[PDB]
Amino acid sequence: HSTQETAIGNFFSRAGLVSIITMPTDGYVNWDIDLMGYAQLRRKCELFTYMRFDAEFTFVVAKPNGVLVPQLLQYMYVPPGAPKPTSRDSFAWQTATNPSVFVKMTDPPAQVSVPFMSPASAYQWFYDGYPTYGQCPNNMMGTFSIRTVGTEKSPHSITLRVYMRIKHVRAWIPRPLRNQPYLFKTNPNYKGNDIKCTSTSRDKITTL
Amino acid sequence: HSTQETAIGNFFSRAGLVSIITMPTDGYVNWDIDLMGYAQLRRKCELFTYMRFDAEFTFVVAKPNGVLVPQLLQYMYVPPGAPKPTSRDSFAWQTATNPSVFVKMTDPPAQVSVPFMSPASAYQWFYDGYPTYGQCPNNMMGTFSIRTVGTEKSPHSITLRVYMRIKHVRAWIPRPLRNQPYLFKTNPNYKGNDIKCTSTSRDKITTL
Amino acid sequence: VAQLTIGNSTITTQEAANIVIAYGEWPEYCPVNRFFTLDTKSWAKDSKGWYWKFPDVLTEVGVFGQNAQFHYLYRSGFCVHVQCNASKFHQGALLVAVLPEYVLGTIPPYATTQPGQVGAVLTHPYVLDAGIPLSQLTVCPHQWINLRTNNCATIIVPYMNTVPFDSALNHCNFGLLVIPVVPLDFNAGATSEIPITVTIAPMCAEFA
Amino acid sequence: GIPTELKPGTNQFLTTDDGVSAPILPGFHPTPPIHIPGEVHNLLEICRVETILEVNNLKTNETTPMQRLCFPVSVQSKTGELCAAFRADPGRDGPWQSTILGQLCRYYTQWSGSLEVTFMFAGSFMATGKMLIAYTPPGGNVPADRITAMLGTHVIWDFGLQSSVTLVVPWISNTYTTGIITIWYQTNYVVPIGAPTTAYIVALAAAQDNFTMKLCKDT
C-alpha cells in the first residue's frame, strides 16, 4: 500500500556494529573510520556510486565478560589531516583541535555525530583514475583514538564495540550489486579462477 | 453510574507477567512472543475472534535472590520471518535489522513497544481451515533473544521476568467463554472422558 | 404464503419476517443465484445435533461448487433457511446458530472438520465439541425453532474475514449448528422422525 | 542546561501506568484496518443478550448435563404447588454460572442494575394451562402458599396464548440481598388425546440498560 519503506533513508537506518575493539592488559588503540570492513554495508553501499551522509557513533564499553568497573575513559576524534597519536603519552592527546569525550564505564554509552567530512561534494566508493598510487579515492572520514586516562596502567581489560547510524542519506547513479566474493578491502578484485554463477542450477529447462 | 470500566481498553490494560526466564551458570535464551501460555489472558482473549493491538514489554531483571550486579545485557528482537540466533556467538547477534537494547542490571527496567505485526488486518486466535499442517493460524508476533554481552562467560545467574501491556485494543465477533480445562496450547482440545458442568449442583430444584 | 423463485429454483415459504441479520450488516459488494436445498435430517427422539461448514457445504453441488475449485479466490455472504415439518401433536425446540471460525476439538481427521454436503453430527452437544458451553451460544446470531409456535428460521450472514479474499478450498468461514435443546416427544403411533430441511442461497458472490 | 530536580517515585516500575514507550521499528508501517462486522466497544453489549439459565442443576444431572437446561411440567402434579425456585444473584454460584452475565461478573467486584428473566414453553400446541411467576424482594421470605405468593409481585402466565413470558427484576446490588423467584402451578396441565403429558420450560436471562459494574478483578 505504502512505498515509504523502500526510501533511501529507511534503507540505511538502524545503527549496526562497525568495529569491536579489544584493549587487554601499548595502552591505546587507533580505529580509522571505514565502512568497507564487513560484508554487509559494503554490498549495500556499492549499489550506488556517490553517497553523501553524516555518521552517528555510539560506544558500548564493558569488560571482556559483561561487567562494569568505575573507570574513566577518553575517546578522541582525530579529524582528517591531523596527525594521529603515536604513544600513550603523546603530545596529540592534549591537542585542543582534536575533540574528545570523557565518560565513565558506568554511564549510558557516549554518542557522537560526525558531519560530512569530504572536500568534494559526495563520497565515492569507485574511483576510476589515479590520485597521484593505486586506484583509490581520498574519502578519509577520520580516526578514533581510545585510551584510559591517567599516567599509570589501569588493571582492567577494556573491550568496547562501536555502533554507527547513517543519517541524511543521498545516493546517486545506481550500479549492479556484486555477486562475486570479496578478496581485499580496497579494490574490486574477484577470484578469477572460479566464477560463481548468479543463480542456482536445475535439471532441464522444463523441470520447474 | 458510569460505563467506562467495561470498555475494551480497560478490560485489557494493567500489564501482567507473560514469562519468567532463567539463565543459570549455552549462554542465551529465545522466548518467542506468545500469549496463550497462562490460563488467564487466554480465556480472556478467547472471548473474541479477531483482536488487533500493539504490545509494550518491560524487562525486570535481577539475580535469583533479589540482588543486582553491574552487568551489561542485550535484548534482541527478531522480527517475524528473520532467522533466530543459533549459538551465543552466532552471526545473528550483529545483524543491523534485528533491533536490540543495551541496558545494565542496575538501571530502571527497559521498555519496548512492538507494533501490529501481522500481514492480515487482525490477529485471529481461531482458524477453522488449514494453512497449507494442523489447524493453526500464522500470527507470529516475533521472538526475543537475550544474552549477556562479552566473549567469555559471566559468573552471574540471570533471571528476568517479562511484563506486557496491551494497547489500542479492538475486538470483533464475541464468543462463548471456555468452561472446560485446557490441555494443549494450540488447539481447543478438551478432556472428553469427564465433562465439567458449568454450574454447581444442589439438592432439589426448590431448595434455594 | 409466498413462492420464492430465484434462478431456476422455487421454494414455498410463508410470510415470516423473522429474519435475523448477523451483526446488523447486509452482504454487499465493493470489498449461483438460486437455492440449494440440501438433504433432510431425521430428528429422532435421541438425536444430538448437526453441523455444516461453509462454504464447504457447497463444493459438491453444481455450478457454484464447480466455481469453487476454480479462480483461487472467493468472497460472498449467505442466506440460510432452516425449517421443520411437524404436526400439532409433536413438541420440541431447536437452536439454530452460526458460529464464525468454528474450530472443533478432539476427545481431528479430514472428514469431520469439513463434512461436506450431508454434514456431521455432534458427539458431546453440551460443550459443542469445542469446549465452549451450549448455554452461551446465544451470543452468536441465533434463532429458536419452537414446534409449538413456528417452523422456519432464516439468518442473513455477511462475509467476515481478516482478509478481503480467501481460498474457498482450505479455509471455512463459519459453521451452522442445529441443536435440539428440548428433545422431541410424541405419543405412540405418530410419525417417529421429523425432517429438518436446510436451504442455502449465496448473496453477493464475487471471485475477482 | 535547565535546572531540574528528581522527586520520589523515580526509577520505579508501576505496572498500571499509561505512558508512551520507545518504538522498536519506526520505519515499519503496519497493515491498515478493514471493516469486519461485529465490533465490540463495551463489555455491556455482551451482557445484554439472553443466555440460558441452568435451573435444573441437580446432583443427578451431572452425568447427562444436557438435561440441566430444561425443567419439566407434568400432568400428575396437583394445582397450587411449587415447580421451581432460585435466587436472583448473578455473581454467586448455582443457576447463574451458565449465563454470560454470571461469567462477566466474576471479572469485577461491584455491580448494580436490573435484570430480565425470560421463560419459554416448549410443549405441544394442543396443551394448555397456567403458571404463576412470583418474585420476592430482598428481605422478605419465600412464600409457602400459592395465595401468599399472589399478594406480592407476580405474573399469571398461561401458555395457551403466550408461549413465552418475561419478568423484570427491579434492582440487585453487591458491595444476603437476593430476589428469590418461584414458579407455581396456577392450574393443572390440560392435555387432549394424543399429545404428550409432560413438557419442558427453558429459562433465559440478561441484563438491562442500567446495569454497570466496576473494580476489575481476576478470577
Next chain:
Amino acid sequence: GIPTELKPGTNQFLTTDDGVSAPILPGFHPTPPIHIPGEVHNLLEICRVETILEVNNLKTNETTPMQRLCFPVSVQSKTGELCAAFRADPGRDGPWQSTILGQLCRYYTQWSGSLEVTFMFAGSFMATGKMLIAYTPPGGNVPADRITAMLGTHVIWDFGLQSSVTLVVPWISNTYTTGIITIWYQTNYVVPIGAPTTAYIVALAAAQDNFTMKLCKDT
C-alpha cells in the same frame, strides 16, 4: 528547579531510535552539494528496470556461464511441444536471482504487486515462425498439451512481425503461489537458404508501478 521523574527505559540504548546527537565539530561548515545526475530517492526506481532473466540455468552451463542468458529455438523441434518453463517467484531461487528485482527482494520480507516479463528474438531477419507464451495462475497445474495451455491466458507471438513481446503477470504475493510461465512451439521454425537454423531468445523482467515491499531484513 522543575520537578521531574525518571520513567522505565532510562539509560537504555535501543539501536533503532532517531534522536539528535552532540555535534563533534560545531564550527565546521561542510561542502555544499552540487547537481549530480541520477539521484535515487526510492529503491522501487531500481526495481522498475528490465534486467535479464537467467532461464537457461542448467547444470551443464556452470563452466561457461555466458550461455545461461539465452535459450535456443531450433528447426528440428516438432510443433506443439514445450520450449521452456519457469515459475514466477522473484524471491525464491532459480531464474529470478539474476534480476535486480530478485536481489532487492532478498533485503525484505513481504512483497506484493504485478510484474512484466519481456522476451526478445535474436535470430535472422529472414526466419519466421510462431510461439505461444502461456501463463498459469497460482493453484492450477502446468499444462501437458499445447491445446490445454491455449484455453487459459496466453499470447500468440510470431517473430515474423514483432521481434519482442511482453507479458504481464497480474499478481504475486509473499507472506506455493506461483505463476508458472510456459513457452510452446505454435508452429515450427521456418528458414530459407543461407540463414542459420538455430536462434536464441533472451528474457527480461521488471516490476510494475504497484509493486511494494516492506519489513526490511538482512540476507
Next chain:
Amino acid sequence: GIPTELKPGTNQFLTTDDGVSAPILPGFHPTPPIHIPGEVHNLLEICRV
C-alpha cells in the same frame, strides 16, 4: 535530547511537599459525592460555638 542539570535537593523526601503522584488505579472511577448536611470547611466554625 534537551540539556538538563540536577540541582541540590535531588532524591530527597521532604515530608511536607504538595506534589502530584502516580495513580495506582487509572481506570477506576470513584463514587460521586452527594449532599450531606453539616460540612466543615474551617476549624474556626467549631471554635465559635
